[PDB]
């Protein structure tokens, strides 16, 4: 029958278990998998859920049974936000196919498929490093600047332009949207999805989320209107124009899935997916480089050898920079920016390893448990970039590294994120030495959210050459 799992209280089930725990949810789930096995169940206030732990079960579900596990759960929060339309939380089906295909094609065509695109990223690193330089080595929080810089890469693809670092209205929208990604992980929202009548209560994190989402929605529709002003039909300049072309071609198809709503949802999703995740990867990398100056120095040694101290970083340099690549992958493995992926659901009744999983069951992919899977990793609890180097000193790709997930829903933005991570990291470490103020003791415990981000920390960036 159904997979077994820990017991919890009546009504609220394992929401109590997760909330009472001293461990963050993904850690709690990995430990429970040592007791009940690789696939176990949680009851989240009456919502029946299975958790997939370790490389093998995750791959068996997302890859071997790719169609069956490619759906999204109809949680009240998600139904309320996007009606299971758009792209990121779209039901597995025609609408998802339509939006996925459009987004994938737009990212190549308006983005990295064009010769001039990398130079637009480099211009962003220059805007970004110049802003860092203005602090003149005094301690500050990088979060805002990194967020601006990274969101701008996708802005180019979506809106056809970057926005300046004085655009406080755009930055405010992103701040509320990011708050929502964090609130989505709270006990308040787990309880809301279990007992949606809690919406009657006016105070709480659930009302903070709903209010933020209304503000963000309006802002996004106004950005999309402005980006469509000078549109030339069938000659799109960006994802918005391309979306509008699609709506025109499907005007007489009534089952066409493209819509004004779905444009706002899919745009919002593309914006927050990229901005939240890539930002946090860089924020974790900087923390660990300041923490471990010998590792920071090896990276800088390699930059100087390959790029030179004044040469412009290029994506083609990556294959000559194995240690830089090792460090970036080890930040992804170790820091787990998306620890529990995005929740899946079964699109039909499933059988996995003898256990029955009924249609619509929520499926949590514990990606953290894959990256700490001792069948595949030696001492996964240790941060060790050199685990990614082969006996000739070259970067070695590992099957059980899946920070972008696997299967049908695997990260659409992976290639772009990898370019951004590499070019921003190297441009930054080429120009500055990074360390903490007064060598101060920084906190490395992540915040609770749907992504893992560090607590606020100051860093001193000092010009090198
Ligand atoms: O006003 C009397 C009120 O009585 C009943 O409510 C009780 C409730 O059921 C209990 O749970 C408890 O409430 C405590 C609550 O659980 C705590 O979370 C807390 O609140 C903090 C929040 O955590 C934090 O988010 C923030 O609160 C902000 C809200 O999130 C935000 O939405 C906004 O709230 C405003 C609302 O937009 C607006 O509705 C208006 O509120 C009126 C209500 O519409 C109306 O129902 C009635 O409230 C009754 C209610 O019916 C009973 O269930 O009158 C309200 C007029 O005041 O205005 C809101 C105020 O801004 O802004 C807030 C900013 O605070 O911060 C708080 C910090 O405390 O503490 C609660 C302790 O009370 O008890 C209450 C009654 O005591
Ligand atoms: C370090 C950077 C990033 C990481 C680690 C990351 C990770 C992930 C993960 C784990 C998923 C879950 C897929 C699943 O459901 O199993 C995902 C989905 C997704 N990501 Fe990313 N991501 C990154 C950057 C980006 C960027 C920059 C964009 C867009 C500009 C993006 C767009 C998306 C979209 C649209 C989905 C949902 C796709 C679908 O449902 O079909 N991601 N990502
Ligand atoms: C799609 C939108 C934009 C317009 C409106 O505000 C409604 C809306 C909400 C989006 C949300 C709110 C809930 C939490 C969502 C679903 C996030 C979910 C939990 C996914 C998070 C993963 C980890 C991403 C960030 C990589 C992404 C989009 C967020």
Q: For this experimental structure, what is the resolution in angstroms?
A: 2.3
Ligand number with the minimum distance to the CA of 367: 2
Do 145 and 410 meet the contact criterion of CB atoms below 8 Å apart?
A: no
Cβ-based neighbours of 366, under 8 Å, separated by 6 or more: 26, 29, 30, 33, 51, 52, 53, 58, 339, 340
For the CA of 272, the nearest atom of ligand 3: 25
List of domains in the chain: 1-465 (1.10.630.10)
Which residue, by CA, sits nearest to atom 64 of ligand 1?
203
What beta strand segments (E) does 332-448 contain?
Answer: 344-345, 350-352, 355-357, 362-366, 432-435
CA distance linking residue 78 with residue 69, whole number of Å: 18
SS3 51: strand
CA distance linking residue 150 with residue 274, whole number of Å: 8
Ligand number with the minimum distance to the CA of 406: 2
Inter-CA distances, 166 with 133, 283, 454, Å: 16, 21, 24
Torsion angle in degrees (nearest 10) through CA of 122, 402, 182, 457: -60
Which residue, by CA, sits nearest to atom 6 of ligand 3?
213
Cβ-based neighbours of 358, under 8 Å, separated by 6 or more: 48, 346, 349, 350
Q: Is the CB of 207 under 6 A from ligand 1?
A: yes
Which residue, by CA, sits nearest to atom 1 of ligand 1?
202
Ligand number with the minimum distance to the CA of 179: 3
Q: Is the CB of 415 under 6 A from ligand 2?
A: no
For the CA of 344, the nearest atom of ligand 2: 15
CA distance linking residue 335 with residue 454, whole number of Å: 9
| 273 marked as part of a ligand binding site | no
CA distance linking residue 6 with residue 437, whole number of Å: 44
Q: Is the CB of 247 under 6 A from ligand 2?
A: no
Ligand number with the minimum distance to the CA of 87: 2
Q: Hey, what are 138's tokens?
A: 């005094």
CB neighbourhood size of 158 (10 A): 27
Return the H-helix or E-strand segment holding 462.
strand 460-463
Which residue, by CA, sits nearest to atom 68 of ligand 1?
203
Q: Hey, what are 33's tokens?
A: 């998998």
Query: For 360-369, b where at least 16 C-beta lie within 10 A, e where not — what string?
Result: ebbbbbbbbb
CA dihedral over 380, 418, 398, 430, signed as positive or negative: negative
Q: Hey, what are 110's tokens?
A: 């308006």
Do 87 and 265 meet the contact criterion of CB atoms below 8 Å apart?
A: yes
265 C-alpha to ligand 2 centroid (Å): 15
CA distance linking residue 103 with residue 242, whole number of Å: 9
Do 457 and 442 meet the contact criterion of CB atoms below 8 Å apart?
A: yes
Q: CA nearest 426: which of 336, 276, 316, 272?
A: 316
Do 287 and 327 meet the contact criterion of CB atoms below 8 Å apart?
A: no
CA dihedral over 350, 352, 357, 361, signed as positive or negative: negative
Q: Is the CB of 200 under 6 A from ligand 1?
A: no
| DSSP strand pairing (362-366 vs 47-53) | parallel
Do 337 and 452 meet the contact criterion of CB atoms below 8 Å apart?
A: yes
For the CA of 407, the nearest atom of ligand 2: 16
* Long-range interactions of 390-399: CB distance < 8 A, separation 24+: 393/322, 393/323, 394/322, 395/322, 395/325, 395/326, 395/329, 398/329, 399/55
Question: How distant is the alpha carbon of residue 383 from its chain centre?
Answer: 21
Torsion angle in degrees (nearest 10) through CA of 85, 90, 92, 93: 30
CA distance linking residue 209 with residue 75, whole number of Å: 15
Q: CA nearest 284: which of 323, 230, 339?
A: 339
SS3 395: strand
What does the radius of gyration of the chain's CA atoms come to, in whole angstroms?
Answer: 22
| 61 marked as part of a ligand binding site | no
Backbone phi and psi for residue 350, each to the nearest 5 degrees, phi listed first: -120, 150
CA distance linking residue 123 with residue 313, whole number of Å: 11
Q: CA nearest 155: which of 46, 4, 257, 278?
A: 278
Q: How was this structure determined?
A: X-ray
Do 389 and 322 meet the contact criterion of CB atoms below 8 Å apart?
A: yes
CA distance linking residue 230 with residue 301, whole number of Å: 48
Q: CA nearest 49: which of 3, 84, 18?
A: 3
Residue from 277, 280, 451, 452 to probe ligand 2 pocket by mutation (most atoms less than 8 Å from CB): 277
Backbone phi and psi for residue 49, each to the nearest 5 degrees, phi listed first: -135, 140
Return the H-helix or E-strand segment holding 226.
helix 205-228
446 C-alpha to ligand 1 centroid (Å): 29
């Amino acid at each position: 029958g159904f997979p077994p799992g820990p017991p919890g209280l009546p009504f609220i089930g394992n929401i109590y278990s997760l909330a009472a725990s001293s461990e963050l949810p993904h850690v709690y789930m990995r430990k429970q998998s040592q007791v009940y096995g690789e696939i176990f169940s949680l009851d989240l206030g009456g919502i029946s859920t299975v958790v997939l732990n370790g490389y093998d079960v995750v791959k068996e579900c997302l890859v071997h049974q790719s169609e069956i596990f490619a759906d999204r759960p109809c949680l009240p929060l998600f139904m309320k936000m996007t009606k299971m339309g758009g792209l990121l939380n779209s039901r597995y089906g025609r609408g998802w196919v339509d939006h996925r295909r459009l987004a994938v094609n737009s990212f190549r065509y308006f983005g990295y498929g064009q010769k001039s695109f990398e130079s637009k990223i480099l211009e962003e690193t220059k805007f970004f490093n110049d802003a860092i330089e203005t602090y003149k080595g005094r301690p500050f929080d990088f979060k805002q600047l990194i967020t601006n810089a990274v969101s701008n890469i996708t802005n180019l693809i979506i809106f056809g332009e970057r926005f300046t670092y004085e655009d406080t209205d755009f930055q405010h929208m992103i701040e509320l949207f990011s708050e929502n990604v964090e609130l989505a992980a709270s006990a308040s929202v787990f309880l809301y999805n279990a007992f949606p009548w809690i919406g009657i209560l006016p105070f709480g994190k659930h009302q903070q989320l709903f209010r933020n989402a209304a503000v963000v929605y309006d802002f996004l529709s106004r950005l999309i209107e402005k980006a469509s002003v000078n549109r030339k039909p069938q000659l799109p300049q960006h994802f918005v124009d391309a979306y509008l072309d699609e709506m025109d071609q499907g005007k007489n198809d009534p089952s066409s899935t493209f819509s004004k709503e779905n444009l706002i949802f899919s745009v919002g999703e593309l914006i927050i997916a990229g901005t939240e995740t890539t930002t946090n990867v860089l924020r974790w990398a900087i923390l660990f480089m300041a923490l471990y100056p010998n590792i920071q120095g090896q990276v800088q040694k390699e930059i100087d050898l390959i790029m030179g101290p004044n040469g412009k970083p290029s994506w083609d340099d990556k294959c000559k920079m194995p240690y830089t690549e090792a460090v970036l992958h080890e930040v992804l493995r170790f820091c787990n920016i998306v620890p529990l992926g995005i929740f899946h659901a079964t699109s039909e009744d499933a059988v996995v390893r003898g256990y029955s999983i009924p249609k619509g069951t929520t499926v949590i992919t514990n990606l953290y448990s894959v990256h700490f899977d001792e069948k595949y990793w030696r001492d996964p609890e240790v941060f060790h970039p050199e685990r990614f180097l082969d006996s000739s000193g070259y970067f070695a790709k590992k099957e059980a590294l899946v920070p972008f997930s696997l299967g049908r829903r695997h990260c659409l933005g992976e290639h772009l994120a990898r370019m951004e991570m590499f070019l921003f990291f190297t441009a930054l470490l080429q120009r500055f030495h990074l360390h903490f103020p007064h060598e101060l003791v920084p906190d490395l415990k992540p915040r609770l959210g749907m992504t893992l981000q560090p607590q606020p920390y100051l860093i001193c960036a000092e010009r090198r050459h």
